[PDB]
RNA sequence: UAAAGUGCUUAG
RNA sequence: AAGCACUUUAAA
């Protein structure tokens, strides 16, 4: 049976009131029904932008019997849309258009209509809404899409085009946006964002190789490439796709490049009656085309395919404009651009609404033909501040830390329960000129020193200490520290930075050792500050059981009258490597400790293949340091596709139904499904220049809005809960899918922000709330569990496929010492 | 691998 | 290529 969505319950009241700016912009659509007509091109499986060149086209040819003076628009695949209904039949009408020269058929035909008023009656309100190309909103997508994707150059949702920012290496920074709409109260709202991404810069390949190689002059000193200069330009340049100077233009998919000049280069010349000639190319050029080659002595593009093998010379090839880089950016690329892409949120804002200032959809046809009106200004919004929550430390004194602008420090606190560290080991991976013994002496002594003062003393001295410099070298280390020892609390390995080392330790310390491990970069062991160290800390005590901090009992909503737990999901995504799906749970009855189980699935599924199990374990875990029965369980999620919310929900409601049917007999608890999610593009300012935070200007810590940019009928929120250091913040929006429980926008929101300040790896406001974190966590601690192992599996005699059978399951199976404890941190 | 924030990822 | 890069973080 279908689901139900619950609506929205009311609006929040609590916090200081913010009048703030939003990138939303209004549309008036009329009430008018819309007809759509699928199209199917018969060379399948091509190029977008073809095909909206295809239909394009055909409009211009075939308007004189059918489309005449309409201006249809298109998504670039099967969904054409037309104002007024289309004359042309129920069966299909198949049209011939032309486009060296390789033409394409089409058949158009009408399947359904979508009402605009049945949009406008749900935006209003006025009609109940919940009793592809078929949901008018995809409709209101499409039309307003079609004329930039005609303009500029279209990459996913966004649009780019070419400006000069050089970012080196033949490659330059194009500007542009992401639009996107969406169904808000009263009125369709369009995102949009502003957004930059790396191209090759469009010049002859010659100036392109120059740039690559840096070779700043080569006409005076004429020099022929090398063996490490030819590898280098045919990575650059193989796969590419270059025009033909010597030709009007003529465009090919460069392939490779010769291994030998122009000079040298000899092709068999193919004539008449299949006779051969062989002849160099600086040759073929000299005698067919008058071509003096400037640089024969340069190598050529081999263009062609194996049968053909075409022989180009850098001399007559340029690039072809509009390609943009796919293969990673180098340190120093990156670098540059974040320097150039850098905006704050105040030039964010004054950027994105000269922007669409200037898009001018007054004077654009494809939105005058469908009666839209869009408006020009930033969506004004009042938002409210919410109040951070107090968060209660330990000792003698019980100090209280008071949160403000969502940021405090452990400077003056100890943990609300410590732990004494008395058998612990330490391994450096560090060579021994990297860090003297004294180094690391002083170092620990630090460590200690901070650690008493943070109420965590760890007492007496390491009773291990020795270098390494293998990294097969960790599983025997490892055994040996779990047997001459017994009752060891942790280790720390030194690392000198990326290395297998950390993979394997992490490997046998959570699943062979299953022992407590703090890895640690020798920079920040040589380079001393007491902010790592403390930080350092906190992750420790947490990996000991320890509790940080615990939410000031008084300062709480209703819903801690009762045993209620929490769980936060995550899937990740391999990119035919496997997906790993992780869901936490909370232990106490205070949110601060968290257990979690991981589980392998299939690739590139979104919904948890096995969900009821793993709730199953957590609760099981909730009995056992707690004896009560858990009667609410708020769920929260984070990875679903906007495209594929209710149907996951389904499946992992009836999936923790099921793990709660199991528990005991007759036992139904209060389930509430919350989904958030980051990715989104909308972006709040503060509309009052004083209230602007920071160098960066962004919005308060505790900022929500609850209004006139959130859904019409679904219980959404945004809730900015972190500091805003960097440019613009990022609102995490959250979106109620179920509630049994019957809270309140008061409640839920004001939960949500608490639970975003008890964050155990920082003493500061995070941007979602602890539990997805955790889940985050525990899914990328199985990513390095499942590694491929060190030695066996890559360079098998690059990459090696993996063990499908259960033993993957036992892969990232955590070593039972390992599992019930934070791990995460 | 002290951490958070951010932007490039990477999705026709 | 799961992984880069930057900014900030225990003076008073």
């Given at each position: 049976p279908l689901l139900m969505v619950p609506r929205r319950p009311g609006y929040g009241t609590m916090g200081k009131p913010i009048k703030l700016l939003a990138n939303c912009f209004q549309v008036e659509i009329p009430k008018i029904d819309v007809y759509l007509y699928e199209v199917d091109i018969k060379?399948?499986?091509?190029?977008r932008r073809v095909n909206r060149e295809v239909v394009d086209s055909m409009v211009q040819h075939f308007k004189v019997t059918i489309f005449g003076d309409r201006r249809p628009v298109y998504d670039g695949k099967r969904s054409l849309y037309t104002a007024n209904p289309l004359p042309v039949a129920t069966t299909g009408v198949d049209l011939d258009v032309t486009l060296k020269d390789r033409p394409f058929k089409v058949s158009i035909k009408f399947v359904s209509r979508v009402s605009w008023h049945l949009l406008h009656e749900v935006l209003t309100g006025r009609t109940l809404p919940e009793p592809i190309s078929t949901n008018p909103v995809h409709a209101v997508d499409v039309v307003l899409r079609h004329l930039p994707s005609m303009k500029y150059t279209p990459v996913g949702r966004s649009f780019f085009s070419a400006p000069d920012h050089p970012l080196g290496g033949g490659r330059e920074v194009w500007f542009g946006f992401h639009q996107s709409v969406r169904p808000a109260m009263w009125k369709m709202m369009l995102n949009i964002d502003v957004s930059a991404t790396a191209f090759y810069k469009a010049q002859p390949v010659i100036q392109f190789m120059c740039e690559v190689l840096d070779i700043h002059n080569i006409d005076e000193q004429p020099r022929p490439l090398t063996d490490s200069h030819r590898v280098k330009f045919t990575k650059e340049i193989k796969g590419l796709k270059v025009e033909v100077t010597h030709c009007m233009r003529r465009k090919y998919r460069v392939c490779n490049v010769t291994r030998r000049p122009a000079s040298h280069q000899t092709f068999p010349l193919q004539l008449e009656n299949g006779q051969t000639v062989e002849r160099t190319v600086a040759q073929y050029f000299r005698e067919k085309y008058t071509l003096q080659l400037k640089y024969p002595h340069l190598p050529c593009l081999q263009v062609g395919q194996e049968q053909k093998h075409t022989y180009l010379p850098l001399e007559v090839c340029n690039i072809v404009a509009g390609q943009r880089c796919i293969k990673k950016l180098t340190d120093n690329q990156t670098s540059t651009m974040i320097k150039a892409t850098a905006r704050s949120a105040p030039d964010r804002q004054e950027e994105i609404s000269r922007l669409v200032r200037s898009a001018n959809y007054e004077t654009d046809p494809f939105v005058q033909e469908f009666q839209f009106k869009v408006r020009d200004e930033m969506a004004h919004v009042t938002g409210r501040v919410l109040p951070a929550p107090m968060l209660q430390y330990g000792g003698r004194n019980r100090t209280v830390a008071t949160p403000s602008h969502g940021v405090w420090d452990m400077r003056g606190k100890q943990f609300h329960t410590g732990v004494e560290i008395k058998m612990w080991a330490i391994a450096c991976f560090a060579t021994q000129r990297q860090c003297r013994e004294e180094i690391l002496k002083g170092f620990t002594d630090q460590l200690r020193k901070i650690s008493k003062d943070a109420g965590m003393p760890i007492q007496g001295q390491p009773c291990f200490c020795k270098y390494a410099q293998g990294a097969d070298s960790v599983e025997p280390m490892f055994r040996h520290l779990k047997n001459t020892y017994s009752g060891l609390q942790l280790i720390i390995v030194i690392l000198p930075?990326?290395?297998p080392v950390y993979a394997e330790v992490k490997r046998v310390g959570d699943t062979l050792l299953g022992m407590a491990t703090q890895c640690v970069q020798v920079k920040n062991v040589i380079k001393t500050s007491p902010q790592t160290l403390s930080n350092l800390c906190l992750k420790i005590n947490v990996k000991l059981g320890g509790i940080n901090n615990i939410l000031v009992p008084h300062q709480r909503p209703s819903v801690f009258q009762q045993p209620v737990i929490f769980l936060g999901a995550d899937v990740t995504h391999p990119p035919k490597k496997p997906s790993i799906a992780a869901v936490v749970g909370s232990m106490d009855a205070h949110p601060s400790r968290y257990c979690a189980t991981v589980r392998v699935q299939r690739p590139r599924q979104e919904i948890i293949q096995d969900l009821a199990s793993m709730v199953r374990e957590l609760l099981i875990q909730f009995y056992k340091s707690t004896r009560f029965k858990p009667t609410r369980i708020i769920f929260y999620r984070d990875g679903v596709s906007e495209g594929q919310f209710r149907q996951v929900l389904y499946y992992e409601l009836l999936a923790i139904r099921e793990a709660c049917i199991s528990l005991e007999k007759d036992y139904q608890p209060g389930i509430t499904y919350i989904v958030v999610q980051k990715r989104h593009h909308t972006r709040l300012f503060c509309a009052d220049r004083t209230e602007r935070v920071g160098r960066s200007g962004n919005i308060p810590a505790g900022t929500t809005v609850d209004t006139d940019i959130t859904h019409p009928y679904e219980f959404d929120f945004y809730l900015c809960s972190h500091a805003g250091i960097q440019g613009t913040s990022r609102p995490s929006h959250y979106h109620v899918?179920?509630?049994?429980?019957?809270?309140?926008a008061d409640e839920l929101q004001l939960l949500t922000y608490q639970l975003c300040h008890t964050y155990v790896r920082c003493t500061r406001s995070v941007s979602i709330p602890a539990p997805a974190y955790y889940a985050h966590l525990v899914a990328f601690r199985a990513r390095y569990h499942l590694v491929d192992k060190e030695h066996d599996?890559?360079?098998?005699?690059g990459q090696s496929n993996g063990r499908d059978p259960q033993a993957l399951a036992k892969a990232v199976q955590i070593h039972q010492d390992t599992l019930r404890t934070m791990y995460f941190a």
């Open positions: 060379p399948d499986k091509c190029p930075g990326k290395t899918l179920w509630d049994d429980n019957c809270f309140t599996s890559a360079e098998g005699s």
